[PDB]
Design a binder for this molecule. Structure first.
Ligand SMILES: Nc1ncnc2c1ncn2[C@@H]1O[C@H](COP(=O)(O)OP(=O)(O)O)[C@@H](O)[C@H]1O
Length: 320
């Protein structure tokens, strides 16, 4: 059995899909998955043992000059890669018209997806051969598990979902694994950031613990912030620029993590690492992490400026 997955975007959404592949592999031995995913996250599916082919798309980038010869080429190579194999099942775990019309529609095989009532965009259901009813009021990880389960003919296990990507890194963990913690300070919205002042205070509180802290960064401004947070603390290091798989390895070796509501926080949960995610304008109950050792820390009045470094540590301490 070879199945095709359409779940391209939002690092988090991609990551939350992993537990479903694990259920499938355990219930259907020998099952392999191909995965159509946004180029920026293409490495994530390769970490799962049940994944074979990873087929990258770049919808947003392609949308800006859709008929240019350069893109036309990429798009042609994409469609050919997508239509190369004939699948026993195509599972659209995205439920958006855009990817359903551009990806799902073109795949060879019975197409499964969420029905009119439960798809993110109802009209997306019209593009599937099998429309499944997946209840909206449950975690995204569970919903996708239910989807894979109903699509492949097996009952969803009652055990907690297992991302099963950690194993990919445990074979080659950083030498200093467990000697440090990782602080994920970078995200996309101003109000989702925990004020720098507070990050430093938290860093400061750990000065005499003996722990080391590593700060990742994706873009120049983030590195600058990273340099400002480490300024003065010898036990704090600013990581070099690296790929997702690179920062994945570092996370895998972190004893624990403190982070803002962002994709890398979801990755950290996928690697089963203790993590304290701090929320402000976004709600964890709706968009929170999945994974057991995932600890939610709400800011007073949902305003991170009101979250003290003291409370975050007084949190890490009482969530040990
Ligand atoms: N390889 C990387 N190393 C460090 N940070 C990264 C890397 N890739 C993405 N990011 C961070 O993820 C964020 C952008 O996307 P995402 O994580 O999904 O965030 P959000 O959920 O806030 O939209 C940025 O803050 C970006 O720097």
């Amino acid at each position: 059995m070879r199945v095709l997955i359409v779940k391209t975007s939002s690092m988090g959404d991609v990551l939350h899909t992993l537990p479903a592949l694990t259920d499938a592999q355990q219930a259907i031995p020998g099952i392999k998955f191909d995965w159509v995913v946004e180029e920026g996250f293409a490495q994530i599916p390769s970490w799962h043992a049940a994944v074979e082919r990873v087929i990258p798309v770049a919808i947003r980038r392609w949308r800006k000059a859709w008929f240019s010869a350069p893109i036309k080429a990429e798009r042609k190579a994409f469609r050919e890669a997508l239509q190369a194999k004939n699948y026993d099942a195509v599972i659209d775990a995205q439920g958006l018209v855009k990817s359903a019309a551009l990806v799902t529609r073109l795949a060879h095989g019975v197409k499964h997806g969420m029905d009119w009532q439960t798809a993110r965009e109802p009209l997306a259901s019209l593009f599937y051969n099998r429309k499944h009813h997946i209840a909206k009021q449950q975690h995204a990880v569970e919903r996708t598990r239910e989807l894979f389960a109903k699509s492949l003919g097996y009952s969803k296990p009652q055990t907690q979902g297992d991302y099963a990507i950690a194993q990919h890194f445990l074979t080659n963990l950083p030498t200093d694994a467990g000697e440090y913690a990782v602080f994920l300070h970078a995200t996309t919205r101003d109000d989702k950031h925990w004020p720098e002042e507070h990050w430093r205070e938290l860093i400061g509180l750990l000065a005499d613990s003996g722990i080391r802290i590593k700060l990742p960064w994706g873009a120049p401004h983030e590195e600058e912030r990273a340099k400002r947070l480490a300024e003065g603390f010898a036990y704090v290091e600013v990581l070099p620029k690296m790929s997702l798989e690179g920062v994945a390895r570092v996370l895998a070796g972190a004893k624990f993590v403190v982070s803002v509501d962002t994709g890398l926080s979801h990755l950290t949960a996928a690697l089963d690492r203790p993590n304290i995610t701090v929320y402000g304008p976004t709600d964890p109950g709706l968009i929170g992490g999945y994974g057991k050792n995932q600890m939610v820390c709400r800011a007073p009045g949902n305003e991170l400026s009101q979250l003290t470094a003291n409370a975050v540590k007084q949190f890490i301490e009482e969530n040990a």
